């Protein structure tokens with residue numbers, strides 16, 4: 109007899125294996141599937157390598173980091189993260205390192221914050237489309253459930269007050285304890301930063317009902333165009349809202365996107381609620397960052413010229429690449445939701461859809477992965493309520509590869525009417 | 526409004542507290558409380574630093590590892606762990622790197638293996654005295670309960686098949702669904718390796734009631750005297766036990782205790798159940814070892830010479846220290862449970878008590894941690910059913926410190942009769 113969790117254990121994985129069974133490689137398999145489904149940021153690893161070399165060395169006082177095992181981590185780590193989080197939000201706000209908490213990547217930060225704010229049975233509101241890991245991350249071992257907040261293309265998938273309320277009030281009508289709402293800002297798969305007002309309109313609805321607002325700002329430093337990224341933190345430093353319960357406000361973070369170090373498993377939880385801060389720290393012991401990696405990060409994120417050079421450079425490349433991939437599709441007549449951040453773009457393949465069904469959508473998908481041989485992500489995968497949208501990632505390959513993927517798309521669409 | 530867990534939150538911390546305030550140190554505080562309550566293994570860190578000055582690439586391919594994020598881990602990591610797990614258990618039984626799963630230290634390994642085996646409300650049998658962290662690790666976020674199994678000093682704290690049946694049936698009459706039994710072998714705080722025949726018994730009864738047998742063999746490579754350490758994996762290999770169902774047997778391991786690298790968070794789950802293996806893997810996303818620590822370790826553990834000398838040296842240093850420490854305590858009449866493993870000894874201070882009540886043990890405990898300035902652990906914190914026993918860790922300090930500590934003890938005992 110295994111537990112229910114293990115005992116209760118594949119459709120959207122089609123592109124996943126199509127890739128694994130035929131990965132594109134310039135020399136080994138130049139016609140294989142090109143991985144465009146993982147939101148990875150490798151445009152600036154070279155800059156990190158240059159650093160790990162000379163400016164200075166950093167990684168290995170071994171005994172100290174080898175035996176250190178406090179749920180608080182190395183002081184410099186906390187300081188560096190808080191420091192790094194600051195520059196990311198244009199110094200517009202400050203972060204108290206004593207509040208910095210660790211988790212096994214954003215994965216663990218998410219599961220932990222949920223464990224800290226909701227009981228099994230309770231529900232959390234999530235705007236859609238939304239990162240699918242949530243379905244497991246926020247729901248698998250927490251028992252908590254999800255309730256989507258509708259979003260259309262007609263308004264660029266913006267989060268509207270009416271929609272936030274409608275979803276919420278329906279839950280009450282369904283006797284479902286709603287304890288919070290979890291945003292992703294910058295957005296995934298939308299790749300767009302949230303409008304200052306929109307955030308206030310959410311925090312307020314959140315505050316007005318004493319429910320928590322969990323901001324997943326894991327894509328903060330991947331902004332590359334206007335508008336500016338507005339942290340929920342910055343909205344807690346504004347007069348118009350000096351009277352908001354800071355107990356219902358939590359931020360989730362990681363170093364996976366704006367430094368591309370997912371393997372380092374650097375999950376961060378920054379609560380404004382002292383109690384939550386603690387529980388998350390006690391829970392942080394199940395997913396503590398490696399002292400070796402902590403030591404490595406403290407040193408690295410402490411170099412301002414670097415942390416300041418990296419941030420600026422990283423914004424450039426991402427923009428340089430996004431624009432290219434954007435013009436690339438504008439050429440063959442493909443439109444994307446306009447975005448300013450992230451490691452991907454929300455592609456509109458609606459004009460290729462026969463009818464307007466998710467089935468029609470999945471078929472187009474089977475073609476892109478078997479015949480176009482590109483592994484992209486189908487909108488229905490992010491719980492998108494309208495067929496035709498596909499998330500396409502462009503930050504994990506060469507310019508050469510991108511242009512190929514672009515060339516392949518040219519033929520597909522070209523032969524589509 | 527936080528969750529029940531977050532809201533459901535210091536008696537035995539006077540020791541950890543005292544130490545933090547008046548921390549011992551040869552020059553700047555020769556009379557600070559000595560840290561003898563942490564099971565840290567520092568006797569061979571010098572061995573690791575030495576090694577760190579050679580072959581191969583101790584720590585940098587960077588883009589590859591910085592981005593590698595497969596729940597399976599770096600290619601060479603699983604194999605290294607398995608080869609290490611073999612050298613450990615004699616090299617007599619074999620381990621399959623494909624079945625090796627990560628977790629955040631033993632802490633994460635433990636919580637996960639329970640998440641996989643029992644549902645909230647279910648219970649697990651635990652011999653006592655036992656590892657206090659279990660009370661959080663095994664029950665907090667799992668809704669699982671622990672059921673103690675009686676052990677006394679009349680029989681050197683051995684687990685008797687009678688004692689096991691009693692807890693099992695006692696629990697059933699009360700309608701508690703026992704889903705498994707979790708051992709610690711080598712033992713914490715007893716610091717003893719388990720009698721092969723005893724394992725064969727626990728496994729028979731275990732297999733005979735369809736409940737899981739989880740083994741925390743986190744202390745496998747700290748044996749410094751006979752008998753030899755017998756892994757449950759070896760038991761699954763004898764002819765006399767061919768019909769035991771391998772679906773119900775599992776191993777929890779880590780590098781914290783034997784390798785002295787707790788800050789590395791190298792938790793390992795090794796299940797003989799293929800489903801558990803799959804589930805545990807899905808769960809590893811929450812607590813994965815850092816690709817950097819993985820790389821480093823793959824390189825260290827892939828060095829047969831280092832590994833041989835390390836294990837061999839560790840056994841001798843832990844052997845020289847343990848004996849020296851016990852011979853000192855005997856000089857003054859103080860005796861401990863006879864052990865061949867661990868990084869501590871089960872000290873019997875029953876004759877320094879006033880009454881066989883935990884109220885006397887705690888009275889003495891304070892004396893020991895304020896006036897003698899030694900931070901140890903009171904038997905009752907290990908759920909030990911009889912007062913007077915204390916766990917005293919002797920593997921993290923210098924030879925100089927141990928004698929200082931012994932000296933303080935030689936005194937306290939002196940002025941007590």
Ligand SMILES: *Cc1c(COP(=O)(O)O)cnc(C)c1O
Nearest residue numbers: 147213214215239296362364370
């Ligand atoms: C990629 C991604 C993550 C992953 O963060 P990890 O630290 O690697 O677990 C989390 N959230 C979103 C929205 C992502 O796109």
Ligand SMILES: *Cc1c(COP(=O)(O)O)cnc(C)c1O
Nearest residue numbers: 630631632656713741779781787
């Ligand atoms: C020390 C210990 C642990 C903790 O292992 P970590 O890797 O440091 O988390 C777990 N279980 C037992 C029985 C221990 O002795």
